[PDB]
Subunit: 503 residues, 4 copies
């Protein structure tokens, strides 16, 4: 197509898409999905990485969930030999602010005045007149204006006055107020530590469990990630951290976060409460875009398929939301209550995979590729040059797939950055790298445990031919199709500087 309008006009529902689905699917684990058999069915449906929500549950619960997911993935991983890698996600509880106790059932009427206090002797004595708040130095931040939310945005207050520990407020439309409810201070820069005590214990637990990825909540500044890396320490150094942008402060210096982060999640749930809801899409379409420029994964999450929790079929709005999320350039999509609490998890994962395939085919590869080429590269490192040239070759020759041999995974990450249509079959000896590769669009990880040959020359060829066999088994390619092969020289670090087209 010549123009974007002509491209949109050229969309044909009759035009069939390719079988391969490049974008990863993230599923939150809960009572509905914790069972091993249900987990195997979800895994066969297309779940690439399972997400554990640490905002609730004990270490024993999540450890048992990890044990169940491991037994299920090993039982499914009985094809080929010891393949099928699957990534582990942590997601921290994060720095939240909570209300006190009145059980509750208090009612707050519009127009009346209530007082949110940090005095501890009101923790249990909460009522409609006065209320305790977890945040200690909320008075240090917050101005004479600034709206306040309680309970997922259901209740709203406006700060009228500020005293030592009172903050007299007026109710900007109110409902039923409970106990230990949400916070969300829109606009204000929160000073709370990025990693709290529970987050510290949870990160150490994740290091012990051997988790692949952490989703860090309320990532505001770049010092946060230094703290997270130093707390994960020497043992967890390989584990990748994905920052969650939930408030205005993280959004404001987003570029610094993306530079410091391994990836970003647009948590539309808390963000929609923080910033005006009507703007949320702007944010994601900004955020995703910037991520695609930086080469870091971006995840669209929260409330994508909500209605499927109760009902077997989704709404048109939800299919449109997921399709627009992947068309924006999102590396991965996420399910929260759909898989954890929902009654119809398999249908959720299935419809997500199918709609991802369709919107994935809908992309305008030539213009998007051209834009990603000029968006940032300079004289270029030389490593990215190999990736961009291989992507261009795969696009021009209409290759069935690209086979990438990598130790760290970086070469496959750059190739995924440049967005080829064909799958990226990344062959690696390291299990953890292959598992965490699912965070990037288009990377099909293949784990090669088979011994190495004395000479590196024939061993790399054996690994590439194993990738060929994988491609035919899955159905990516057949005899006579061309593919791109990227290798290097010497068995060391990032040296992927060979490109080949082979039929």
């Amino acid at each position: 197509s010549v123009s974007h309008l002509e491209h949109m006009c050229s969309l044909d529902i009759d035009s069939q898409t390719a079988f391969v689905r490049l974008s990863g699917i993230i599923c939150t684990i809960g009572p509905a999905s914790v069972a091993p058999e249900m987990l195997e069915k979800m895994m066969a449906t297309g779940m690439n990485i399972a997400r554990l929500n640490f905002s609730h549950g004990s270490h024993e619960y999540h450890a048992n969930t990890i044990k169940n997911i491991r037994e299920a993935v090993d039982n499914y991983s009985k094809k080929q030999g010891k393949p099928f890698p699957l990534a582990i996600a942590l997601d921290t509880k994060g720095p939240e602010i909570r209300t006190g106790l009145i059980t509750g059932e208090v009612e707050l009427k519009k127009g009346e005045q209530i007082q949110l206090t940090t005095d501890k002797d009101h923790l249990e004595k909460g009522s409609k007149d006065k209320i305790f708040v977890d945040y200690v130095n909320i008075v240090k931040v917050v101005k004479k204006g600034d709206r306040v939310f309680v309970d997922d945005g259901l209740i709203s207050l406006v700060v009228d006055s500020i005293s030592g520990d009172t903050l007299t407020c007026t109710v900007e439309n109110g409902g039923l107020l409970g106990s230990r409810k949400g916070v969300n201070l829109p606009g204000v820069p929160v000073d709370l530590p990025a990693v709290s005590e529970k987050d510290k214990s949870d990160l150490q637990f994740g290091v012990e469990q051997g988790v692949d990825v952490i989703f860090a909540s309320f990532i505001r500044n770049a010092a946060a990630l230094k703290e997270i890396r130093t707390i994960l320490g020497e043992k967890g150094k390989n584990i990748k951290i994905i920052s969650k942008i939930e408030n205005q402060q993280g959004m404001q210096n987003l570029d610094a976060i993306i530079a410091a982060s391994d990836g970003i999640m647009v948590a539309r749930g808390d963000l929609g409460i923080e910033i005006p809801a009507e703007k949320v899409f702007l944010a994601q379409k900004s955020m995703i875009a910037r991520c695609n420029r930086a080469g870091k994964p971006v995840i669209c999450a929260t409330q994508m398929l909500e209605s499927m929790i109760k009902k077997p079929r989704p709404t048109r709005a939800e299919i449109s939301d997921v399709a627009n999320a992947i068309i924006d350039g999102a590396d991965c999509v996420m399910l929260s209550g759909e898989t954890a609490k929902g009654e119809y998890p398999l249908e959720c994962v299935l419809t997500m995979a199918k709609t991802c395939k369709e919107a994935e085919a809908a992309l305008w590869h030539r213009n998007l590729f051209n834009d990603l080429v000029n968006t940032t590269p300079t004289p270029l490192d030389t490593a990215s040059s190999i990736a961009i040239a291989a992507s261009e070759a795969a696009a021009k020759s209409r290759a069935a797939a690209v086979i990438v041999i990598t130790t760290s995974g970086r070469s496959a990450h750059l190739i995924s950055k440049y967005r080829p249509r064909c799958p990226i079959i990344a062959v690696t000896r390291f299990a953890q790298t292959a598992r965490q590769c699912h965070l990037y669009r288009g990377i099909l990880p293949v784990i090669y445990e088979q011994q190495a040959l004395e000479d590196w020359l024939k061993d790399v060829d054996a690994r590439v031919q194993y990738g060929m066999d994988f491609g035919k088994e899955r159905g990516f390619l057949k005899p006579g199709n061309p593919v791109v092969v990227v290798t290097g020289w010497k068995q060391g670090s990032g040296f992927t500087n060979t490109i080949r087209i082979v039929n």
Copy 2:
């Protein structure tokens, strides 16, 4: 350092802090039902931003809809307390269309029977299925099912919940096996995807409904299951001399309408993408493709396009919508959709006012997000030939408003077409369309950016004095509503002769 070289750089440049303009260009369509039928609630919806009301004739009698029309007319006249300026509001008729339905389940036991996979079900001439219906027998009203269905084709029942595949074909009966089985209910629709049905676009009930709408003086009709252009020829002939001015909007609900979309869009006054039936017809995963195609083609043709069905569903039960619904409406308008529509949200839903309000807000934001320069260049480049003398005026006025960052463009029009041409090119500023004719101003709401203003003052003998008076009236409207203030530039388009399709003139004018 510009306003984005590439589309990716444009998306990167979106800033939540950058405030949008007060004006909201895209129209909001609301379906009327028991929750919204009351006149007071209708006035509240109108004040919230409802531009056109939609009446679903698939249910209810003529007397009910006549009472609804009476209430909407009384309400729109009651709203006319803005300075004493009668506010125009459009009324739309959505046809029942040629549908195929099953009968009722017995009240015996639980409401709905369950149908499981592998079982038997007889398609017969069961006439007493309105109260004795069950799991054994099913009757259909489609006479010509035989010539139309093939072997491997699939059949759906009840909103896609149950799916069957036709095994064998006899004289009056189809034999099927249950592919996907669920809870068979009462009075459910039967839609077959792949296959094109030969049913007439306008049935007898549709004929009576269209004549009733013409008599009532409805502004627009939404025609369901529009397959070919002969449908629209028939609709024009049935509307006759009286309804000739009423605009027909074709609804693309099945694969047959999708296949020959260009002929329909050429023959139609506008198109609605009714994703309700469409998601059942073509695979649901593909529906967005259709809309993103359909809307796009409409924007090329200069005809209105409506994104509809299930936009704000969650708000029926709960006061606030989900992120997915806001994303759907925002992407619908960013695709280029002129109007958005609410079905159960306003008609059946519990929170209609909140639905209309949140729709207006998210519409404003996604409206501001657009990339005007590239989209304008594309819309300019789609028509390579020498452009029509009227369309040249429209495109030049849009370019002038874009370059001078005009607060608004004032259009004086009798038929309404010139404002439609200006709306095609998607200007950021509002399009203040001045018209003496009430119905043209009312139906102008189908186009993005047109604020209709109705001019009741009689025709002055001197044509130049009259056109200047109407342009000054548009200025007064803009100042009262708050579109513009003193010192802002605006574009004024008039004509060269006193009549109809003779538009012309472009002028940049400040404010006093």
Copy 3:
């Protein structure tokens, strides 16, 4: 066309060009063209503005040339009955450096060969005795400006020297590149920032003479540090305030601060003659393609000059290289093209003007209007004033409707200039009461000036309609348009002088 390469592939010799020729042709007047009858013939051929080179000739000579040009425009004015405007341009001698005189003995021009030494002495008492051992400068003490490693040129770049040693009054140099040195030849210093006065005494007298004669345009030579144009405006004074000044970029300094000059100037000429001597000749095209381009951004006229059709001085037909040069000059975006020795001294001036008009028409037709228009639209930033918005919208309307022409009603001429910036294919028929504005309108590409003598109508609306109809009549007589064609008309809202803001599409009767 989608792309530039595909556009170049799409050029078709079968594709007929438009009748109109938008780009102006500048002709230098000399012994071959000074005669009144020959001058009328040149005007009929298509000469839009006449150029007078003040580097030679007296005030009386140029006044007589102006008299001949006026009588020629007078007798041409009975072709179709209306007064044909033609602009007269004054090109200043400028601050140039020349050598002294050779001893009349031997051959006229002594030869200087590479590797030998020669002494520049500045001392004025060595005016006749110059030879291969000693050389002489014209004016200004360049030793305060020149360093040792610097290079020096003599005679149109033919001879090159490098300063070996510097003394008080003198200068010892070695010949790097050697040629044939004559007497009183030009001297160009490529590296040094020149200290010469922007306006000299003779230049002052010449500008005052041009003001008295009522010249339309001045071409100011050797505009280096942009501060000059203030001096030029102050010397033109109250009488010349309306006269437009075109800066000539001939050396490295003018190229270095080109943006300040173009902002301060009314237009720019790329004088490739002196420029090719100053900067390396191989680079000249870069300069022009930069300079013209920036002018197109600014909305200022730009002139490509010097040695475009040189061979036609001697022979009746040009070479392929010269036709390519003029075609590429106009395709670059140059508003006007100029002939120097071709018309002044050359034997075949009329053929030069003819071939210039033809090749201008062809390269004019070859342009890619859509992409260039989009580029010029995206060059303009903020919510532009209503006048620029009207000009850009009118250009877009003329392009979309394939208008036969655009009729502009203007007093000062600015509105037609803004329309000319955006490069419409159709002619820009600018109707004006003021003769001088119509005359100087030829500096802009695509403007056909029309002078309206009647006017003084009681009703202002009827007067503007009469002037637009007179523009229609001009278009029909010349053949721009016929009944049934649409055209764009831009007028104003109130009787003023720089208001515009009206656009209409009207068909011809």
Copy 4:
């Protein structure tokens, strides 16, 4: 550098270009350049291929020129261990129409006046006494091809006549523009498509002579259709099958069905000399900017020729218009530039080659690489052969990494031609064992041919690595690169299909 206008605005004369000069320079050989010393100096100055015009001179003269060029290329090889490759080109006389002898005596040139009458006759018995009354031509089938108001030219397009009437054997004509008629003058019929055979008897003997001499390329004049090249290939036969043919587009018929010619030909030269006579001269640039462009789309070399630097024949310095012409010719996308009278008859051949190289470097640097590359990417079909995909990927990698050079190993030369099609800024060092392929590589922009004399090693990878390392050594000798610079190396199996980025050792 967002837009083309902004690109032209951003051009800086101070911004230094790379030392490499990609576009080839063609020089016509004549009395001024035939000497061995002049030929060696031209070769060192930058002469890439020498052109022989067979419209004049005998077989002995051209054989002496070829002997001198071979002696010159061997004698130049004073670069420490560098065997210098050089291409030789043959330009055919072609099917031309000429008059007989005048009666010129007494004064040098007779004067013929405008408005007189002239009778063009095909009767052969009017030949010796021609002067001004009746004129004979050698084209037999003029009557079947010429129409009424068609025009006729005499003397290089300087003089013009119009055919008034037509009889059986003769035509009566009227003088529109009048000059002096000489002897053996060219006659071109513009409007008409000429039916003459592309290869005449003399053309046959000349092409076989060129095959015997071992010429690299032939320039075929007045190429109208593809049957011309069918005849040329059959005349080259088994021995000349490898020789590449460049078609000269001089008339309207070749322009009309240009696509078939460009597809069937190995390359095209836009001979602006005869073309300016055929089509209106004012239009010629259009043609070239089309022709060159289409060649760049097809991937075949295109040459802009004739009258580029004419003034340098008489004067030591060129005009601004001529420098602009050559710069615009290369900026259009012309693979090679050519000199006719500048080097053959002119007094200053070396100076012509010098200024040509300098202006070529400058206009080469001025190019907008990204947009031209993107256009060349989108012009090529959807599924593409693996070789062109390798070439486009190598060009994109060289552009992104700002490689110092690209090393290409090829036997036939095509892969390097595909890489040259996409126009990389860095030089394309093409290593080949066969001399003639290296010679004919000069027709393509950016290819520096390198001839590798070392014999076939038994191990394949060691042989390919030795050839690439010799290319590295060549780059260091010329001064293209230093340690730490990246370069592109394209190799393969057996058919090229390997592309790698390697830095400098």
